[PDB]
Symmetry: D2
Subunit: 106 residues, 4 copies
């Protein structure tokens, strides 16, 4: 799917996690984010259209996705332990990742 | 793309790393292994076509990829450092993960 | 060393990284932080001196370190690859982890 | 403690996880392995006693613990979710890391 469509999915489900009542909303949303993150790996963003697939920017770009996927991984385990509040705090920190890539390649 | 196709991309690049001689060979193979692993994230194995996307059977199926992806990510950093023996050793330990999933959902 | 000292090491070397000019400096700081983080593991924060060592608070407190240590590990790889700015970007993110713990336990 | 002792603790609890009946044991066991690995961090093993704490051999030696610690981290989450058998799978899984370091530096 479109990088944009994958971003929108990340964004929708993120908010869903921040306004979640139960651990199940958090689990469902996180699983969805991990899929989006995954399908977004192979994508090349506008600001790097001219760049080489092997350039540092592109390698750094995809690296942000590995970091994200990793932080969603952890988030899920917490939500799985029923520790909702912290699962939400963990989602907040991966936001530190959303911003970073954005400020650099969006 | 397809699961087999991705598993083949996966299976073929593991042997290339095995027969690896230098760092460029290891990187490019791992770089390709990561795209495949990432692309086979949403696939539904055969032995679970009946289970819900949100069922606990899928979560655990998908968990294995998080693991493989994390291991390939780090292995790449090693190959990026010119640490061929190290990188190859890391790859070897991916099997510890490949086999785990296989002896369960293959 | 005690918590305070391992913490001053974390802080000082974090600052070194933010003001670094080359990969050499960052690698050196990250290495010291890896040690300080590893050494701080088993300490009991004062605001938890009354809690049992296996209480949820202490398990959560240690979880903060797993994350921290993991981020210092990845940050270093980036420094070892001569990616100074990316490392500094990773240093900044592991900062979300210093603050997270502190808001909750200091 | 010294390396020997940290290693017994790691060995004693690994087995405890292997023959565990309930999850409580596993959690408790992993937690102790976690502390033993962190403590082993600043250790200089016999075979590398002629190398400095800034050498490639020592960084490779230590990276071995970053790997072990991350695998205990995931093992403990699974044990926290009640997933006991998977926890043992993951535990038997990190043994891959135990050997790999012994085969090279023991
Ligand atoms: C959980 C984290 C993230 C969230 C919630 C998120 C959300 C968004 C949103 C709302 C947009 C605006 C465009 C749209 O979707 O309509 C966007 C765009 C974008 N994101 Fe993210 N994003 C995230 C992570 C990332 C990461 C980690 C990277 C890179 C490593 C990244 C790279 C981009 C790029 C380059 C665009 C622009 C795409 C275009 O203009 O076609 N994003 N994201
Ligand atoms: C890098 C390690 C891995 C390698 C080298 C690998 C390799 C392969 C190969 C060559 C096959 C044989 C059948 C075929 O190719 O058509 C296969 C099948 C399969 N692998 Fe893996 N695999 C790995 C990791 C994993 C992981 C992590 C999972 C689980 C999360 C997994 C799930 C599967 C499944 C479900 C099949 C059967 C596909 C089907 O029947 O359509 N594999 N793998
Ligand atoms: C790179 C990240 C970190 C930095 C830069 C940092 C820095 C500091 C500094 C400068 C202090 C004050 C030292 C003092 O007590 O005199 C401190 C205190 C403390 N930090 Fe951190 N810290 C970090 C991560 C952590 C983490 C992740 C945890 C918990 C998991 C933690 C827990 C604490 C606690 C509880 C104190 C109080 C120490 C005491 O009362 O003796 N720190 N930290
Ligand atoms: C679950 C993981 C591990 C287990 C069960 C384990 C177990 C052991 C045991 C039983 C010994 C026997 C010698 C003695 O106790 O005096 C030992 C020694 C040792 N281990 Fe491990 N170990 C583990 C992981 C590691 C890792 C990850 C490294 C390196 C990164 C490592 C490095 C060593 C070294 C260097 C020795 C030799 C110490 C000496 O000769 O004084 N081990 N370990
Ligand atoms: Zn965790
Ligand atoms: Zn590594
Ligand atoms: Zn990385
Ligand atoms: Zn996990």
């Amino acid at each position: 799917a479109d990088l944009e469509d994958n971003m929108e999915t990340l964004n929708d489900n993120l908010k869903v996690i921040e306004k979640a009542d139960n651990a199940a909303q958090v689990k469902d949303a996180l699983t969805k984010m991990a899929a989006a993150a995954a399908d977004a790996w192979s994508a090349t963003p506008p600001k790097l259209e001219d760049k080489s697939p092997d350039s540092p920017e592109m390698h750094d770009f995809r690296h942000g996705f590995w970091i994200l996927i990793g932080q969603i991984h952890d988030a899920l385990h917490l939500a799985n332990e029923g520790k909702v509040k912290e699962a939400q705090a963990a989602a907040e920190q991966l936001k530190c990742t959303c911003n970073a890539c954005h400020q650099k390649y969006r």
